[PDB]
Design a protein around this ligand. Sequence first.
Ligand SMILES: [Zn+2]
Ligand SMILES: [Zn+2]
Ligand SMILES: [Zn+2]
Ligand SMILES: [Zn+2]
Ligand SMILES: [Zn+2]
Ligand SMILES: [Zn+2]
Ligand SMILES: [Zn+2]
Ligand SMILES: [Zn+2]
Length: 466
Amino acid sequence: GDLIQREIYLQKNIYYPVRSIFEQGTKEKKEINKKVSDQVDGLLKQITQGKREATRQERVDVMSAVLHKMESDLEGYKKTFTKGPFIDYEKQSSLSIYEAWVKIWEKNSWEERKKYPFQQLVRDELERAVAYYKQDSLSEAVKVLRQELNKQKALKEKEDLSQLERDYRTRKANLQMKVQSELDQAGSALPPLVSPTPEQWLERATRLVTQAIADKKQLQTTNNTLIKNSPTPLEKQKAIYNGELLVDEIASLQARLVKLNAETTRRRTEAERKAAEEQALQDAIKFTADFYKEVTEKFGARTSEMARQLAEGARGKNIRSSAEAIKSFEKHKDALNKKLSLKDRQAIAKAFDSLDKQMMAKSLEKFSKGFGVVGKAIDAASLYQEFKISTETGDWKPFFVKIETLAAGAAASWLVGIAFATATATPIGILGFALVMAVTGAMIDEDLLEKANNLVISILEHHHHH
Ligand SMILES: [Zn+2]
Ligand SMILES: [Zn+2]
Ligand SMILES: [Zn+2]
Ligand SMILES: [Zn+2]
Ligand SMILES: [Zn+2]
Ligand SMILES: [Zn+2]
Ligand SMILES: [Zn+2]
Ligand SMILES: [Zn+2]
């Protein structure tokens, strides 16, 4: 009724309660950030037990947990406030609030009003006034916590990137050794090789490097997609780094492949040279076999058989001493001087003078190879001259001395090569070739001298007369 009653009602039921709500509301908003910060720290101190400082992850985890609880309370208070219209309590008169409340109440029916009195609505509206200031302070508390949480997340991300850079630099440094270890790992899958030639293990190493290049290039195409479709900068930087590492590895592998290709070529060439050495040996054996045939063609069966027996009888023997040779040759000598004419001596001496040194040297290397005796140094012209002097004079003692000196400690077969090399480079004739074999034979074996000595005499079907 009375205007005093109305003023008492407005003060008691609207102004005095709302003002308290607003006072408590502002008190909470002033202390919320401090209380939120202290719950985070107090909880972090519980996890660590004040023995160590909390990790960035531990900080992010607690702050997120607290924020999720604050956001759910915010939604709750924001739902209650939502149920009615917006009244900015602090800026309204007690009459403004009253008329707003009356309008809300009037929305009901008369029967509704009997079950829900105005005083009941007043109670509900004051609960909604608390809800309004609760959601307002909580909205600010959430904005601050979300900003601090985000900063922490950013710091963590920066820290993760620093360790990613650290892992990369270390890996980058250990490049050469890493590729070697990777190739070995690939190599373990492979079965054992027995007595491998260098060309065999080079082929296997070339296969590992080639496949490692092929696989690393396939990983690079895959990694380019990983960079393009990255969900976070951390996952992108991981891919950027791995991609850099992959190019470094491929280049290391390619450098290795170049060396392998070069070495393989060196090995192949070497094997071709070795194979050409075995062919030269077989061609030397062919040349020795052909020499006997050619001798048969030009001098007949008996001279060739005498050359063949000279070569076979020298096998595994060494050269005798000049004294031995002089003694053996002096024994059978008398007949030779008497049955050998001056014209003969001159014909044999002349042949030796016409001797071709180049073809002689080439034949001696082939015969020496065929007999499997080492290549020996000789001044051929010196040797032949002494042979010629020895043919012209009756004296062979200075010949034997020259051969012993020239070939002391050598195989008897080398002398045979010298004998044979002479027949191929000189117009020596059947007689000269037989005397050469006789002289060579005295330096090897007594029975080889006797056999050749018989051939010389037998060859002397010359017309020696008046
Ligand atoms: Zn306000
Ligand atoms: Zn690697
Ligand atoms: Zn070949
Ligand atoms: Zn022929
Ligand atoms: Zn004898
Ligand atoms: Zn004669
Ligand atoms: Zn005659
Ligand atoms: Zn006579």
